[PDB]
Amino acid sequence: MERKISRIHLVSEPSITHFLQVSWEKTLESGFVITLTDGHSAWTGTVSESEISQEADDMAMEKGKYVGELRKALLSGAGPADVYTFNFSKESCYFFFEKNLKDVSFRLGSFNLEKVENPAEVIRELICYCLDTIAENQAKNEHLQKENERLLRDWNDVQGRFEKCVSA
Amino acid sequence: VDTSVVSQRAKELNKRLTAPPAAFLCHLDNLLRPLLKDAAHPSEATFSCDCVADALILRVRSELSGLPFYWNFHCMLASPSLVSQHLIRPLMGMSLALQC
Q1: Chain A: residue nearest B66 by CA?
Q2: Closest CA to A12 of A79, A78, A70, A94
Q3: Minimal Cβ distance to B67: which of A58, A102, A106
Q4: Which of residues 25-84 of A touch B (CB under 8 A)?
């Protein structure tokens, strides 16, 4: 099970950062669960494989590149030469993301979200995941730092002995 | 073709594209001019032709930023004056110049 959190600036209110989390089972192809949270009230929704396939077919492009574009869009994988635009309407509960290009936008995709009735739980879960991840990464970093210190000491010692070996 | 027809056709074919006519024509020029000026260019632009009683549909499929871009030319048989002024008279002038 995989999850990715990204920051976004909705064009409707371009002054507050909203946080979008995408959770998928084994790959982005199978489907995913999208949760968009603004810190007070959040919206959640589910997208199945069938919707992705239909969107790809209508878009008139191969599935691989459509999945690549989705990954580069939602999963913060954008490179330098690409600017995207996300849109959300709360009154209609509609979400859609497009790709801007020199005054030419392309409606890459569109989902529908249904509000969650207790934002506290989802906010708490997201913060919990973030804290757990930082803890685990810190553990790994400290471990490999210790390993490198040990190995460097070993290398110093062995080369020091090699000098004498060659001299003799 | 003028601007309104371009905008209508662009909305129809490219359902998910939303651009002003000026930008669309600029992109079409950037897509076509490289091929017309010189071949063997490393650009993705496939062409096809259909036929009807009189008309010809020239279909252009390409990609910009890797995303699809379709256009169709609905060409009707050219008027006698246009064919004359563009082929018959210039070719006669060319022949006379080469003879000189």
Answers
A1: A65
A2: A94
A3: A106
A4: 58-61, 65, 69, 82
The string over A91-124, giving b where at least 16 C-beta atoms fall within 10 Å of a residue's C-beta and e elsewhere, is eeeebebbbebeebebbbbebebeebeebeebbe
- If DSSP states are collapsed to H, E and C, what string results for chain A? CEEEEEEEECCCCCCCEEEEEEEECCCCCCEEEEEEECCCCEEEEEEEHHHHHHHHHHHCCCHHHHHHHHHHHHCCCCCCCCEEEEEEECCCCEEEEEEECCCCEEEEEEEECEECCCHHHHHHHHHHHHHHHHHHHHHHHHHHHHHHHHHHHHHHHHHHHHHHHHHC
Resolution of the structure in the document, Å: 3.1
Taking contacts as CB-CB distances below 8 angstroms, the residues of chain A near B70 are 60
Method: cryo-EM
